[PDB]
Design an enzyme around this catalytic site. Sequence first.
Site, PDB file in Angstrom:
ATOM      1  N   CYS A  72       0.962  -1.320  -0.003  1.00 55.49           N
ATOM      2  CA  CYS A  72       0.070   0.126   0.098  1.00 55.49           C
ATOM      3  C   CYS A  72       0.647   1.176  -0.008  1.00 55.49           C
ATOM      4  O   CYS A  72       0.881   2.034   0.973  1.00 55.49           O
ATOM      5  CB  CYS A  72      -1.001  -0.147   1.165  1.00 55.49           C
ATOM      6  SG  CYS A  72      -1.998   1.295   0.940  1.00 55.49           S
ATOM      7  N   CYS A 103       1.152   4.377   2.461  1.00 51.72           N
ATOM      8  CA  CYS A 103       1.586   4.059   3.666  1.00 51.72           C
ATOM      9  C   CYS A 103       3.090   4.545   3.752  1.00 51.72           C
ATOM     10  O   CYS A 103       3.588   5.092   4.807  1.00 51.72           O
ATOM     11  CB  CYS A 103       1.461   2.645   4.171  1.00 51.72           C
ATOM     12  SG  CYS A 103      -0.234   2.229   4.072  1.00 51.72           S
TER      13      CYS A 103
END
Length: 108
Positions: A32, A35
């Site tokens: 992700c 992040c």
Amino acid sequence: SDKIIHLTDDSFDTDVLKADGAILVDFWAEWCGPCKMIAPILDEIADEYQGKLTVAKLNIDQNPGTAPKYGIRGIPTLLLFKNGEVAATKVGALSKGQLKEFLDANLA
């Protein structure tokens, strides 16, 4: 993660639910991207708010159960836990300014 607390589902109980003070729990995963983008921001925040805010990260890939438990819509997901109670939350990334504002508004 220079000054970030890496939580797990197992540690969540004691570290977050039985906490005292304000803990910003960032739910994340390696894949992700955003992040990783917020990570340095979270470290800067951690430094700036030393003793005022406990900045934390929670790896959902390793700890999936947390996502269902907190009805996580999508990562990065910031959950601001005051003494185990979610005071506020944020789905998605933030800019440093907005993050400081958000945190400040919660800390009050």
